[PDB]
Amino acid sequence: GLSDGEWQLVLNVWGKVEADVAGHGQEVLIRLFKGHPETLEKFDKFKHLKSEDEMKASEDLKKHGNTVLTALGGILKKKGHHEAELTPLAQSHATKHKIPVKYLEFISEAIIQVLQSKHPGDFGADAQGAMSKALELFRNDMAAKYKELGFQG
Numbered sequence: 001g002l003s004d005g006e007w008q009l010v011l012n013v014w015g016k017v018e019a020d021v022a023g024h025g026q027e028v029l030i031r032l033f034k035g036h037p038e039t040l041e042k043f044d045k046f047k048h049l050k051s052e053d054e055m056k057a058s059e060d061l062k063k064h065g066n067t068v069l070t071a072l073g074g075i076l077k078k079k080g081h082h083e084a085e086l087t088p089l090a091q092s093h094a095t096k097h098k099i100p101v102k103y104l105e106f107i108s109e110a111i112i113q114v115l116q117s118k119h120p121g122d123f124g125a126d127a128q129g130a131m132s133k134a135l136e137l138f139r140n141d142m143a144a145k146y147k148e149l150g151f152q153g
């Protein structure tokens with residue numbers, strides 16, 4: 001549960017990611033790969049990128065960042081009523097990609113790091129706390145679906 005006011009600060013800052021979705025997606029995955037290299041091991045398509053210059057050059061890394069943030073935007077706009085948007089994600093991530101929950105935590109922190117670097121002016125103390133609670137609900141709900149799916153890391 002976030003208040004209505006919190007959901008508003010979340011959608012507001014989300015408006016700035018939507019003015020450049022692939023741009024922000026690409027830096028989130030770089031921040032993630034740079035910050036927890038082990039996460040790169042889950043991506044066949046990218047385990048061959050050896051440096052930040054190669055990641056930056058990567059057209060497919062950019063398309064995938066786009067995918068990720070377009071999926072996450074759809075969830076956020078639901079303001080917590082996102083079961084339907086969430087299921088399919090939990091099903092592939094658990095069964096197919098075998099992504100532990102800690103990895104969800106890693107990407108949540110890269111998302112916040114990107115918004116802080118790119119929009120300091122808009123991403124003050126209030127927007128920061130609201131976005132954190134929004135990503136923390138997303139992860140708690142993903143963890144529970146995992147659980148009913150019979151998994152979890």
Ligand code: HEM
Pocket residue numbers: 039040042043044045067068069071072088089092093097099103104107108
């Ligand atoms: C904010 C959290 C995330 C979102 C919204 C998200 C979204 C997606 C979407 C929409 C797809 C494509 C359709 C599907 O397979 O479900 C995808 C595929 C994938 N995801 Fe995620 N993801 C997230 C986090 C993660 C993390 C943290 C990892 C790895 C450490 C990861 C690994 C993968 C892989 C390996 C694929 C298939 C990539 C390919 O085409 O080879 N995801 N993700």
